Amino acid sequence: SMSVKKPKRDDSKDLALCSMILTEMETHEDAWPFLLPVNLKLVPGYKKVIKKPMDFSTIREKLSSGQYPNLETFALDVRLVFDNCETFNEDDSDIGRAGHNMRKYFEKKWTDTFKV
Ligand SMILES: CC(=O)c1cc(-c2ncccn2)c2cc(N)ccn12
């Protein structure tokens, strides 16, 4: 509360660390569905159905331009990619499988980096 703070966490490295994590997402073999925005002209339903489209390139641009105020806003965008993927794709599809794999991949790195 006013003049009562919990101990100051060192957040000075968060930007570098999220960048690193994103770089590792971008270079994963199953990242291909997520690298660029879904083309809303070419994928019927997507615009109407997916209210907040998100992809790795868009995240990279937001990250590099100071548009994440903190590491949690960054994790929210990453997860949004996978939540969108689940909304639009069958679990039993390459893309549905890619999304599950990448979420798992993300969450481990997230935990190892910031929890542990
Ligand atoms: C992420 C996603 O839903 C996605 C990703 C792709 C995609 N397809 C080919 C190459 C890259 N991404 C795609 C294609 C569709 N027809 C429908 C949905 N997607």
Side-chain angles (χ1 to χ4, degrees), residues 32-34 38 42-43 46 81 84-85 88-89 95:
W32 56 267
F34 311 113
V38 176
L42 297 187
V43 186
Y46 205 89
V81 176
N84 287 349
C85 182
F88 207 80
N89 299 265
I95 294 170

